[PDB]
Symmetry: C3
Subunit: 112 residues, 3 copies
């Protein structure tokens, strides 16, 4: 099991859920985040301090898939979230030790 | 050390913090998220595009516990977050390589 | 590769991004969260239920760095986020199995 964590542009999310659905992935969990990177917001200095005046929204997609699916999931998200412009974002893969589906108690692959 | 990540229904959170407190867990960190799964929101098509018009709020509980507590923490959250209805959510367990408490520099178990 | 996850006080974020920038870290991802711990919000009881009436905002910094940088990143964040008062927060380190930069397909260290 893996937790694929993808930090994408908020407008690429419909296309991302689509690819994932084309792969057979039942569901996912989404978070709103602010991004900092090469592409940065505007700053302002006021009284010896520099304050951020604009922010770069991103969407964090967090999806648990099996060891047989993650590599395909990574590739799918990469292709689905790509624009070719700076700020496209990241995909990180972390290892899931255990998984539980709260409704049924199902574990491992059956929890996803 | 483990990071227990639980994606639950937002109204089951008071009951979840309670169980965790009954286990001796000092604290936790909570995030607001949108869920997608079997239980889905409503959609709308407008001009060759399908837009989501309703969303399913979930709460993400993120709690670091020791290797001697995580299995009990998982079980507690599972029982505390269960309703028996579709959408109860997930619990994922990931491995924590290092931990630091910012205030005191305490590490490992003493950081939690 | 590691995902350094730091749960800090929201006003220590400018100082945190600064240290990270002094270390050569290109970017990071930030989330708004609620904290529960020793330092707690106010509660209220109404009709046989206890409701939370105040909340403790925290900022979650999530930054992927290489195996040669993480220990320095942890230390930097610890020093940059420290106040000496209760509620300073946590830093957790998790292992990243794979990394992809969506724009270019670059992997591993080149993805960060
Ligand atoms: N070290 C990092 N850890 C976690 N997320 C990052 C990191 N660097 C960048 N990001 C995320 O990637 C997004 C894009 O960063 P940017 O460098 O502007 O473009 P690109 O990813 O195309 O190089 C950022 O807004 C940020 O959310
Ligand atoms: N593959 C997944 N990865 C991460 N979170 C998921 C995944 N599948 C479902 N979830 C989360 O679990 C919640 C419940 O999903 P759903 O399938 O509707 O009910 P159940 O979990 O009872 O089967 C979703 O709203 C979503 O937040
Ligand atoms: N077990 C835990 N798992 C994840 N985050 C935690 C945990 N315990 C505390 N935190 C986070 O650390 C913050 C500070 O907790 P608190 O105990 O009040 O102060 P301190 O970290 O200085 O002991 C909390 O608001 C919470 O967000």
């Amino acid at each position: 099991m893996k937790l694929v964590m993808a930090i994408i542009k908020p407008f690429k999310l419909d296309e991302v859920r689509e690819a994932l659905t084309s792969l057979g992935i039942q569901g996912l969990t989404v978070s709103e985040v602010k991004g900092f990177g090469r592409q940065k917001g505007q700053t302002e200095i006021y009284r010896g301090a520099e304050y951020s005046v604009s922010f770069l929204p991103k969407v964090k997609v967090e999806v648990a898939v099996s060891d047989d699916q993650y590599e395909q999931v990574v590739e799918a998200i990469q292709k689905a979230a790509n624009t070719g412009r700076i700020g496209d974002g990241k995909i990180f893969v972390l290892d899931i030790a255990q998984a539980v589906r709260i409704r049924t108690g199902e574990t491992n692959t059956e929890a996803l």
